[PDB]
Design an enzyme around this catalytic site. Structure first.
Site, PDB file in Angstrom:
ATOM      1  N   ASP A   1       6.011 -12.094   8.123  1.00 42.19           N
ATOM      2  CA  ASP A   1       5.888 -13.317   7.042  1.00 42.19           C
ATOM      3  C   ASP A   1       4.518 -13.999   7.220  1.00 42.19           C
ATOM      4  O   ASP A   1       4.638 -15.140   8.022  1.00 42.19           O
ATOM      5  CB  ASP A   1       7.175 -14.024   7.050  1.00 42.19           C
TER       6      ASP A   1
ATOM      7  N   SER B   1      -9.148 -17.410  -4.851  1.00 43.87           N
ATOM      8  CA  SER B   1      -9.693 -16.098  -5.829  1.00 43.87           C
ATOM      9  C   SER B   1     -10.704 -16.626  -6.605  1.00 43.87           C
ATOM     10  O   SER B   1     -10.752 -17.886  -7.413  1.00 43.87           O
ATOM     11  CB  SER B   1      -8.410 -15.661  -6.213  1.00 43.87           C
TER      12      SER B   1
HETATM   13  C1  LIG Z   1      16.330 -13.192  -0.276  1.00 45.73           C
HETATM   14  N1  LIG Z   1      16.572 -14.489   0.730  1.00 45.73           N
HETATM   15  C2  LIG Z   1      16.263 -14.366   2.328  1.00 45.73           C
HETATM   16  C3  LIG Z   1      14.931 -13.884   2.520  1.00 45.73           C
HETATM   17  C4  LIG Z   1      14.470 -12.615   3.052  1.00 45.73           C
HETATM   18  C5  LIG Z   1      13.168 -12.312   3.050  1.00 45.73           C
HETATM   19  C6  LIG Z   1      12.346 -13.593   3.316  1.00 45.73           C
HETATM   20  O1  LIG Z   1      10.914 -13.144   3.625  1.00 45.73           O
HETATM   21  C7  LIG Z   1      12.651 -14.799   2.863  1.00 45.73           C
HETATM   22  C8  LIG Z   1      13.862 -14.920   2.548  1.00 45.73           C
END
Ligand SMILES: CNCc1ccc(O)cc1
Ligand SMILES: CNCc1ccc(O)cc1
EC number: 3.4.23.22
Length: 330
Positions: free
Chosen positions: A35, A199
């Site tokens: 992430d 952007s």
């Molecule tokens: C679908 N909610 C849980 C979740 C899953 C992946 C993420 O990057 C953030 C939150």
């Protein structure tokens, strides 16, 4: 040093990508979601409330000879979709694609919200935003990238997400065979803890490019492309029958439509998102209404270049003293 790991879509829509991560000694391999919009490395664990685990692979620190409780440390995080998780913290050895960090903070979930329990493919998240966003208290912890940086050949990582296919996260080097043309670099603001950039504009389909500054974040942890309402309306106006549905929660369009591409500017360069990348399929099984991959950011407070945009590019996250982002076509 370097590392290189394959990242794989969790489903046929590319809703998220999970990448294998080795934690502990002997290694426990978990599938985490890298992430770039958050800064916690957290995992389902032997400490997670049992009723909140449904098919995920768990980290068991008591089985790792290198795990150490980080005494007194707790963490708690909330995501943009209303999901959340929290727990305590261990340090342990973490390896990604052959790159090893010792003493990495591994945040062990005691509690996860319903949308974490409901998805068995995500064993937790590996944050790649700036460490200023890390939620560990009372001593904030560093991300995997921050801990690895000094050892890397170059202080960079790259995201090469696939469309309906696996892709690659590389650490410490730029694979010059993985993109076409040149990489265009653009300035980053770290003031909010994100890979935040501006952007230079957009085009819809074969239309003329509109030069306009769009501040947003490069976020591998967000599925869709969230842009200002003006831009999003201009896109969906080119799709017959598309409309914003308050009940569904965004723009929907007839599944029979062929979607136009969407281009975004990176300096003087242009990244083209093919129309098919913007199709997120029926809103419910069997429906002929399909969910759009470009949505308004008006209710968010920030524009988000999520996977829909990033998967159209080879993306360099340059973590030099002054960070920058690079984008290339591929
Ligand atoms: C679908 N909610 C849980 C979740 C899953 C992946 C993420 O990057 C953030 C939150
Ligand atoms: C950030 N939302 C993408 C996503 C990821 C996982 C999931 O179970 C649903 C949605």
């Amino acid at each position: 040093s370097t590392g290189s790991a394959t990242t794989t879509p969790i489903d046929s829509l590319d809703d998220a990508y999970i990448t294998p991560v080795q934690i502990g000694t002997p290694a426990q391999t978990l599938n985490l979601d890298f992430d770039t919009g958050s800064s916690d490395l957290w995992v389902f664990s032997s400490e997670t409330t049992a009723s909140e685990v449904d098919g995920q692979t768990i980290y068991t620190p008591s089985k790792s000879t290198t795990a150490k409780l980080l005494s007194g440390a707790t963490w708690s995080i909330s995501y943009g979709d209303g999901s959340s998780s929290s727990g305590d913290v261990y340090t342990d050895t973490v390896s990604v694609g052959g790159l090893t960090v010792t003493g990495q903070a591994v945040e062990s979930a005691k509690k996860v919200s319903s949308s974490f329990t409901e998805d068995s493919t995500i064993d937790g998240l590996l944050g790649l935003a700036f460490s200023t966003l890390n939620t560990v208290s009372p001593t904030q912890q560093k991300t995997f990238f921050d801990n690895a940086k000094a050892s890397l050949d170059s202080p960079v990582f790259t995201a090469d997400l696939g469309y309906h296919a696996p892709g690659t996260y590389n650490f410490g080097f730029i694979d010059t065979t993985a993109y076409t043309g040149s990489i265009t670099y653009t300035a980053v603001s770290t003031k909010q803890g994100f890979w935040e950039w501006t952007s230079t504009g957009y085009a819809v389909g074969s239309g003329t490019f509109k030069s306009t500054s769009i501040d947003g974040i490069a976020d591998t942890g967000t599925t869709l492309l969230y842009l200002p309402a003006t831009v999003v309306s201009a896109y969906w106006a080119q799709v017959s029958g598309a409309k914003s549905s308050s009940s569904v929660g965004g723009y929907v369009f007839p599944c029979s439509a062929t979607l136009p591409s969407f281009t975004f500017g990176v300096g003087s360069a242009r990244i083209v998102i093919p129309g098919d990348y913007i199709d997120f399929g029926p809103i419910s099984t069997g429906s002929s209404s399909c969910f759009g991959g470009i949505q308004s950011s008006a209710g968010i407070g920030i524009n988000i270049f999520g996977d829909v945009a990033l998967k159209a590019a080879f993306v360099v996250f340059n973590g030099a003293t002054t960070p920058t982002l690079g984008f290339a076509s591929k």
